[PDB]
């Protein structure tokens, strides 16, 4: 018998659970045997981003299954973290000083990095392929109102708030109801959902 | 402040911005150490740790953040032979063959044994690449040039492309990789991507 070499990662045993329009036994979702964690469209996740030397957060948008060999591809909408926001572009849209006054740019860079909610994410329609071996934890993303309520009890590594969707460049913000984006993502087809989201920030 | 470096920092990739011709607008990346130059249209061999082997892409956009010089390298994903759907491929190029013998296995074995392992298949699916995973510039040519270079190919640098297809390795449409290359560095990134994407869709 061919004894296949394994790695610790193989102990987790991510399982592909397929279901029908509502029940079980099509729509797929991933379940980790070791702890029961389940991932599917609409779920936001904290992933290790080695290129950034820190974590990145995404909203799973598609579990692509290759029926010929069970190879799975996890695709997700990319959120931007505070340091990916274009401060000036942001203030020109929400701070009258940016358009009325002529303050030096550094003024807005310092102001943003000093006042921005570091746990406020910005949804973008830009898809990225994720690898399960980089999974950190399920993210708890909520809108501004819930955030106000939870403010005093936030787990800075799991809880985040989203009020806008914007271009990957961190500009052109559009108010959104993240909870509804989530419901919408797991309801309509992948390409249709992403395209709708992509058009929200362009004329 | 003494900044901590890694060997990667010795390569020093440089950002070069030029007009629609040259000078000091479009961007290119140049590695100071060996002079390697990368820009839209260029196909590249990258290490793919998720795949445990290399992957090939065609750079489609060099995104620059002029606020901090952080660059994002986006590229069209090529599929390698082992990512093609044997059935669909067989079924599309040889077929009008009323039958299918021992499906999966006969097709997987047949394709892998008759396919040009150095034939890539373009897809309009974008992926963000990291320079620290760059291996070498790929030499992707059309079918005619490949026959000429046939007996003198470098297995890890020389590739031939004749089709664009869906990321799932099906629905192959004839394309001229050289023409795609000229087109990519000529029109807007999104415009180019969207065009390539529709090439395999009903319309
Ligand atoms: Mn980005
Ligand atoms: Mn790695
Ligand atoms: Mn793929």
Comparing CA positions, the residue from A109, A123, A121 lying closest to residue A167 is: A123
Distance A50 CA to ligand 2 centre (A): 7
Comparing CA positions, the residue from B170, B203, B193, B189 lying closest to residue B62 is: B189
Task: Find the distance separating the first CA and the last CA of chain A, reported in whole Å.
Answer: 61
The whole-angstrom separation of Cα B29 and Cα B96 is: 48
The whole-angstrom separation of Cα B187 and Cα A92 is: 30
Nearest-ligand number for the alpha carbon of A74: 3
- Token digits of residue A93: 């849209």
**Contact status, residue B119 vs residue B160, Cβ threshold 8 Å:** yes
Instruction: Give, in order, the Cα–Cα distances in Å from B155 to each of A77, B99, B138, B148, B189.
Output: 35, 35, 10, 15, 30
* Resolution to one decimal, Å: 2.2
- Taking the CA of residue B162 and the nearest CA in chain A, the distance in Å comes to 24
| CATH topology (fold) of B7-203 | SH3 type barrels. (2.30.30)
The whole-angstrom separation of Cα B120 and Cα A45 is: 32
- The bridge status of strand B139-141 relative to strand B53-65 is unpaired
φ and ψ at residue A15, rounded to 5 degrees: -105, 145
φ and ψ at residue B62, rounded to 5 degrees: -105, 105
Hey, how many other C-beta atoms are within 10 angstroms of the C-beta on B156?
13
The whole-angstrom separation of Cα B186 and Cα B203 is: 24
Which A residues, 24 through 53, put their C-beta within 8 Å of a C-beta on chain B? Answer: 51
Nearest-CB residue to B85 (from A68, A128, A131):
A68
The structure tokens 């994903």 sit at B77
Residue ranges of the domains in chain A?
8-203
CA dihedral sign of residues A184, A190, A196, A201:
positive
- The bridge status of strand A120-130 relative to strand A159-165 is parallel
Partner residues linked to B139 by β-bridges: B158
- Across the interface, whether the CB atoms of A109 and B67 are under 8 A apart is answered yes
Half-sphere exposure of A109 (CA within 13 A, CB side): 6
Nearest-ligand number for the alpha carbon of A57: 1
The whole-angstrom separation of Cα B18 and Cα B26 is: 5
Q: At what angle do helices B189-198 and B177-184 cross, to 10 degrees?
A: 150
Asked if B130 is an interface residue toward chain A (Cβ–Cβ < 8 A), one would say yes
The whole-angstrom separation of Cα A164 and Cα A174 is: 5
Hey, how many other C-beta atoms are within 10 angstroms of the C-beta on B149?
14
Half-sphere exposure of B5 (CA within 13 A, CB side): 8
The structure tokens 């800075």 sit at A156
Spell out a b/e string for A152-187, using b for 16 or more CB atoms within 10 Å of the CB, else e. Answer: eebeeeebbbbbbbbbbbbbbbbebebeebbebbee
- Token digits of residue B18: 């030029």
Comparing CA positions, the residue from B127, B159, B132, B165 lying closest to residue B146 is: B159
Partner residues linked to B160 by β-bridges: B119, B141
- Token digits of residue B186: 């000529």
Instruction: Give, in order, the Cα–Cα distances in Å from A56 to each of A157, B122, B143.
Output: 11, 28, 41
What are the start-end ranges of the H helices in A74-136?
87-94, 96-100, 105-115
- Across the interface, whether the CB atoms of B65 and A169 are under 8 A apart is answered yes
Helix, strand or coil, per DSSP, at residue B61: strand
The whole-angstrom separation of Cα B117 and Cα B102 is: 23
The whole-angstrom separation of Cα A131 and Cα A124 is: 19
- Token digits of residue B116: 């040009």
What are the start-end ranges of the H helices in B61-102?
86-93
φ and ψ at residue A49, rounded to 5 degrees: -120, 90
Chain B nearest-CA residue for A132: B50
> In chain B, what residues touch A70 (CB-CB under 8 Å)?
none
Partner residues linked to B148 by β-bridges: none
Hey, how many other C-beta atoms are within 10 angstroms of the C-beta on B77?
21
CATH superfamily of A8-203: Bromo adjacent homology (BAH) domain (2.30.30.490)
């Amino acid at each position: 018998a061919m004894t296949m070499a394994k790695t610790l990662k193989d102990l987790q045993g991510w399982e592909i659970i397929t279901t029908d329009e509502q029940g079980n036994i099509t729509e797929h979702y991933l379940k980790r045997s070791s702890d029961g964690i389940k991932l599917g469209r609409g779920d936001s996740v904290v992933m290790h981003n080695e290129a950034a030397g820190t974590y990145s957060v995404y909203m799973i948008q598609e579990l692509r299954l290759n029926t010929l060999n069970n190879v799975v591809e996890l695709w997700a909408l990319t959120y931007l973290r505070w340091f990916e926001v274009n401060p000036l572009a942001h203030y020109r849209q929400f701070n009258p000083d940016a358009n009325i006054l002529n303050r030096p740019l550094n003024y807005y860079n310092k102001l943003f990095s000093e006042t921005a909610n570091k746990n406020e994410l910005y949804l973008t329609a830009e898809l990225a392929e994720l690898q399960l071996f980089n999974f950190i934890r399920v993210a708890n993303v909520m809108d501004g109102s819930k955030w106000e309520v939870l403010k005093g009890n936030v787990d800075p590594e799991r809880d985040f708030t989203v009020r806008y969707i914007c271009e990957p460049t961190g500009e052109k913000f559009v108010d959104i109801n993240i909870e509804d984006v989530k419901a919408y993502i797991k309801k309509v087809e992948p390409r249709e959902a992403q395209e709708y989201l992509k058009d929200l920030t362009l004329p």
